[PDB]
Design a protein around this ligand. Structure first.
Ligand code: NA
Ligand code: NA
Lengths: 19, 75, 75, 19
């Protein structure tokens, strides 16, 4: 679904600097 | 038939004691103990990568004090 | 023994078709079908109130297009 | 715990205007 993919993108983005 | 909306929220940090030899599933199983989310409904992320259940933390360079991200995955 | 952090995330909206006569548990059961969270690990909130499992949506004036909030509750 | 109570407070706060 669209919400889940947009959230996935947001969290992948976040993990780039929060690891 | 009535229509309602449910907005889901989770924004918390949890600490796990794990082993480098542990699989992402064994991590997902420790997580399930804390938060009750079935492992097949957890998407674990680290440093831009989605983590695969059969592979180990050592395979992703997950080390002491690494921050993993957990996304709830609907069914 | 290795220490890691897991940051949990959920920020999504779900639509439920329910009945005013339904209990908060029956709502929690519909939710569990979508997101896999056990009902005893869901804290449902509406308009500043925490909702009780044995009481009905009608008891809280939950109506068509009401927005409930779901907080994940650890164990 | 402290995190859960602070999140509970945040979401109750939010639901006051998002209902
Ligand atoms: Na971001
Ligand atoms: Na708020």
């Amino acid at each position: 679904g669209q919400q889940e993919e947009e959230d996935l993108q947001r969290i992948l983005q976040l993990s780039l600097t929060e690891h | 038939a009535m229509q309602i909306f449910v907005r889901t929220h989770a924004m918390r940090t949890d600490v796990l004691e794990v082993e480098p030899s542990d699989t992402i599933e064994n991590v997902k199983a420790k997580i399930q103990d804390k938060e009750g989310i079935p492992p097949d409904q957890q998407r674990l992320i680290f440093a831009g990568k989605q983590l695969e259940d059969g592979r180990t933390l050592s395979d992703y360079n997950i080390r002491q004090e690494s921050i993993l991200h957990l996304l709830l995955w609907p069914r």
